Amino acid sequence: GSSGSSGTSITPSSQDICRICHCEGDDESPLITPCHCTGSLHFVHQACLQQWIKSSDTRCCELCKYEFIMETKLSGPSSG
C-alpha cells in the first residue's frame, strides 16, 4: 500500500496556535493578535506574519483592514 491516509479536516478550538505554520507559540514567536479580530485562529506568529504579508501581498487585515504589527527598523526594499 504505497498510499497514506489524509483528507479534509480542521483543528478544533482546543488550543490556540499559529494559523500559518500551526505550531506552539514560542517566546520569540508567541501567538499575538495582528489586529482587533479575535476568537478564531487569528493568532499568528510575529515572524510568520511576515512570510504571509509577502505572499498574500497584504499588510492590513482583509475585513477590518487594520495594519498588522511588524517590528520595523529600516525602510528597506519597496515597490517602485
Stretch that binds Zn ion, among 8-16, 46-54, 72-80 (CB under 5 A): 46-54
- Is residue 17 involved in binding Zn ion (CB under 5 A)? no
d(CA 51, CA 39): 22
The strand ranges marked E within 1-80 are 31-32, 44-45
| Residue tagged 499568528 (cell numbers) | 44
Write down the H helix ranges in the chain: 48-56
- Is residue 41 involved in binding Zn ion (CB under 5 A)? no
Interacting positions 56-75 with Zn ion (CB under 5 A): 61, 64
Q: How long a stretch of residues is the chain? A: 80
Which of residues 39 and 80 has its CB atom nearest to Zn ion in the complex?
39
| Binding positions for Zn ion, rule: CB under 5 A | 18, 21, 35, 37, 45, 48, 61, 64
